[PDB]
Design a protein. Sequence first.
Length: 124
Amino acid sequence: KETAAAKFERQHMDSSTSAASSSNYCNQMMKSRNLTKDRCKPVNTFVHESLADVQAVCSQKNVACKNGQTNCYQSYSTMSITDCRETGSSKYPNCAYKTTQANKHIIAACEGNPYVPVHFDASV
Ligand SMILES: [Cl-]
Ligand SMILES: [Cl-]
Ligand SMILES: [Cl-]
C-alpha cells in the first residue's frame, strides 16, 4: 500500500517545471502520475515548487480544513500551481483535462512524524 505522504507526492508535486507549459500539461501529467489508470480522477492540483518548500507548509499558518479537521496549514507565500479538471468530453478510458495555471497559497492537511503533507485541501 502507498504511504499517505508518498501518495501526496505522486498526486501533487511537480518540481520539474516552473509552470504548466501548454494546455496539454494536465492530460500528460494526469496520465504520467497514474491518475487515469482505472478511472479519470476528476480534479487534481500539481504544485510547481520544491518538495522542501511544500513540506515546509506544515509548520506555517494553521487553519481549519474544509472538513473541519484542524491539521491544515496555509502557505505564507503564493506558489506556482496547475489545477487539472475533467472537461465535458472527458470519458474513461479517454480522459481529457483543462489546464489552469495560477499563483496562489496552498492549503495542506499534515500528519505523521516527520509531519508532512498528506492531503491537498485547496488553494487560495
Ligand atoms: Cl513515505
Ligand atoms: Cl503509481
Ligand atoms: Cl487536488
